[PDB]
Structures are given as C-alpha cells and as structure tokens.
Amino acid sequence: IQRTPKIQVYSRHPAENGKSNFLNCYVSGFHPSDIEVDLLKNGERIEKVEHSDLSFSKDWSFYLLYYTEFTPTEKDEYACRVNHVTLSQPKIVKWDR
Amino acid sequence: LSSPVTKSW
Amino acid sequence: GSHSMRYFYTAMSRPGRGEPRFIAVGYVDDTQFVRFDSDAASPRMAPRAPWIEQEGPEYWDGETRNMKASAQTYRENLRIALRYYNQSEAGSHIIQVMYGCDVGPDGRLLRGHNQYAYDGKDYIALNEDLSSWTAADTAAQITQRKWEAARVAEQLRAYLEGLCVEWLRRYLENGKETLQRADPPKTHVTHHPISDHEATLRCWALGFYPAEITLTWQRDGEDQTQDTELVETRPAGDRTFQKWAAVVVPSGEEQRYTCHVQHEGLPKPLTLRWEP
C-alpha cells in the first residue's frame, strides 16, 4: 500500500577536495510519489537544488535524483534530508566519500 | 513517439 | 545490442488542491528523451535529449496534443477508479502506465508492453500476445470487459508493432553516438577494517552505460549472494550509472575473495581482487 524511500547520498565523480563536483541524493522504491528532499551543507538547506522528472520502476515504485553543484572540503559536512508520508520524522543520511 | 490510444477505464 | 522504448505516465489526484497532476516521461533504454508535466507553467511535450531536438513543429505539437488528451482521460479514469473500488472523494490516488516496445539488433519487434496500475498495484496488463488481457481484480475485470467490447487490444497492437518500432528505430539512428554506445564500468576494490579480525571489501563499478550490470563476490570461487550487500544501481547525473557490492571478510583471508563484473561494454567479464 505505502512504500518508504531508499536513500543514497553520493557524488557524481570521485571526491577530491577543492575540485568541483556534483552532490546527489537518489531516492527510490517509494510510493506514493509526494516526497520532500533537501540537500544539507553543514546542517543548512542548499538553495536551487535541481531534480529529475518523476519516473518509476517495474514494480511501480518511484525514483528521483536530486543534485547540486558543490566543491568538497575536508571540514564541510553534507547530507540528504528526506520526508515522506511513511516517515514519522525526516530521515537524514550523511554523505560518506 | 507516444501511444495515440488512451481509453476510458 | 537490443533496445527498448518506454513511456511512463503518472496521474495523481489531490482533492482540494486542483485537478490531478499528469506527468509523462519517455525513454530509449536508460536515456530519457521527452517529458510532459501538467503542472508546468506552459505544459507541452519537451525535449530531454539532444537527438530529439531535431524533430519539427508537427512532432512537438502532435505530442503535446496527445499528452493533454491523455491527461484528461486519466483524470476521468481516476474518477472511474474511485467508483470501482467504493472509495471516497477525499483521498489522493495514483494511476500509473508503462508501455512500449523491445526490438532486436536487426530492429525487429522482440515484444510489446502495455501495463496499468492503480495505487501502486497491478491493475490491468496487455498480455505478450498483444490480443488478450490480464486483470488483477474484479474492477479491472470491468475495465477488461469494456476494452474487449471495443477491441482496444487491436489498436494497441497496431501501435506497438507499427509506430512504436518505427520511431524507436528512427531514434536509435538519430542518437547512434550515444544510444548505440556502451560505456564499460571503471572498477576498483576498496578495503576497510571494521575490527581487528574483520574487514569490508567493496567492489565498485562507476561511469557505466547502460544501467544493466552484474557485480558478484566469490569466496574460494563460490558465490556469496547471501552475504553480499548490494546497493541499487544509481544514476550519476551524466547519463552513466554507479553500483557497488560489499562483503565482510575475516582478516587475512582477503585474497580468497574475488569480485566479478558483467557488463555489455566489457568484451569479457572482469575478475578483480583487493590490491593492497
């Protein structure tokens, strides 16, 4: 009836401090389609994050890629915050190189 | 090219 | 290789918040090429790949018309479905559609698909014969009787065997630089001790297209399917995909583990190990 999102946080290219890259949050396997996704830099919401057009898998579950340009450093902490009807509170997944 | 056939359920 | 064209429709009702949203996307293999969103400021079928942009005004206008007509029909279908399942008008519901064709290397139809869901569950599906139906429940049986009466299956077959295959071939030719190019995965193994007597071996595949791939860990030549953590294949955002497979091994036994990679872009399957 309702399916909770799987979440992956990762970079487009292998992370190299000081080199420009893309931060991705891929949310998948969820139903229904409404979902709230934020990319966080040091706990704060990144602006103007883009995302792919809504589509779904063979089991009818939805997937979306949220992405933003970023330049990784040693100190800065990145995460993805997801809320869905199946979640009592937003789930946060930290980016791990 | 999309399907031109869409019928009522 | 072989190829597929696929369209995905999502119609979602939202009582109190206007008419149902209709979103359509089109794909060749793992490459999206068109989109339509009824919530756009100016809703229209729009290009999402460079090789589709060369299609003229007639294409885009025709497709836009078809998408709006489709959207209307699916709003109606949401109402109908409300009736079929004795549901109230207060809840949000979703109709999904996925359809299209698969052709072989010679461009000949391998098979067709035309499948419908309601609230994430199978509703009704055109069988592989492109002439009969499989209904998932009694409501879908009502729909099935309607469509058998109106010979909808014939029209769908006419589309899937004709225009679907023809335009798929056309797209494959126009986008041959990308649609007919496989990018092999760039692979490597990482090693992370988790304790004094255990470590994680992670086999990485990056930058591959299309998405289909197989990563497996073997211990002493035997598949560790039950003990392997396998993440869902994920898009990088540059058309390519990523995947990894991880296994937890006893310290000092790392060299008994081998990662095996199968992908269309590889002339032969790869075997790799942790290289300290």
Length of chain A: 97
Report how this structure was experimentally obtained: X-ray
Domains of chain C: 1-181 (3.30.500.10), 182-272 (2.60.40.10)
Do A and B count as touching (3 or more CB pairs closer than 8 A)? no
Interface test with C, best of A55, A68, A70, A93 (most C CBs within 10 A): A55
Chain C residue closest in CA terms to A14: C206
Tokens of A44: 């704060």
For C54, residues 6+ apart whose C-beta sits below 8 A from its C-beta are C174
The dihedral built from the CA positions of residue A30, A12, C214 and C222, taken in this order, carries a sign that is: negative
Chains in contact with B via at least 3 Cβ–Cβ pairs below 8 Å: C
Cα–Cα distance measured from residue C212 to residue A32, given in angstroms and rounded to the nearest whole number: 26
Q: What are phi and psi of C49, to 5 degrees?
A: -140, 145
Q: What are phi and psi of A79, to 5 degrees?
A: -150, 170
Do C and A count as touching (3 or more CB pairs closer than 8 A)? yes
Cα–Cα distance measured from residue A88 to residue A18, given in angstroms and rounded to the nearest whole number: 37
Find, among C63, C56, C28, C67, the residue nearest to C165 by Cα.
C28
Domains of chain A: 1-97 (2.60.40.10)
User: Do residues C23 and C38 touch, judged by C-beta distance below 8 A?
Assistant: yes
CA dihedral C128, C134, C136, C140 (to 10 degrees): 130
Cα–Cα distance measured from residue A56 to residue A4, given in angstroms and rounded to the nearest whole number: 14
For C250, residues 6+ apart whose C-beta sits below 8 A from its C-beta are C197, C198
Length of chain B: 9
Tokens of C69: 């007509």
Sheet holding A44-45, edge to edge: A44-45, A36-41, A78-83, A91-94
Resolution as reported, in Å? 2.0
- Residue ranges in chain C assigned as alpha helix (H): 57-84, 138-149, 152-159, 165-174, 176-179
Report CB contact under 8 Å: B5, C152: yes
For C86, residues 6+ apart whose C-beta sits below 8 A from its C-beta are none
Cα–Cα distance measured from residue A60 to residue A51, given in angstroms and rounded to the nearest whole number: 19
How big is chain A by its Cα radius of gyration, in Å? 14
Tokens of C90: 């207060």
Report CB contact under 8 Å: C163, B1: yes
Find, among C53, C172, C34, C32, the residue nearest to C102 by Cα.
C172
Find, among C265, C252, C270, C269, the residue nearest to C201 by Cα.
C252
Report CB contact under 8 Å: B2, C80: no
Cα–Cα separations (whole angstroms), residue C232 to A31, A37, C167, C191: 17, 19, 31, 20
Which of C23, C120, C234 faces A10 most closely, judged by CB atoms? C234
User: Do residues C210 and C236 touch, judged by C-beta distance below 8 A?
Assistant: no
Find, among A66, B6, A31, the residue nearest to C93 by Cα.
A31
C35 touches chain A (CB under 8 A): yes
Chain C residue closest in CA terms to A13: C236
CA distance C190 to chain A (A): 12
Chains in contact with C via at least 3 Cβ–Cβ pairs below 8 Å: A, B
Cα–Cα separations (whole angstroms), residue C221 to A9, C7, C224, C243, C244: 32, 41, 9, 22, 19
Report CB contact under 8 Å: A33, C48: no
Cα–Cα distance measured from residue A26 to residue A6, given in angstroms and rounded to the nearest whole number: 8
CA dihedral C189, C192, C196, C197 (to 10 degrees): -40
Identify whether C250 is preceded by a cis peptide bond (ω within 30 of 0).
no
Neighbours of A69 (CB within 10 A): 13
Cα–Cα distance measured from residue C52 to residue C175, given in angstroms and rounded to the nearest whole number: 8
CA distance C105 to chain A (A): 23
Is residue C68 classed as helix, strand or coil in its secondary structure?
A: helix
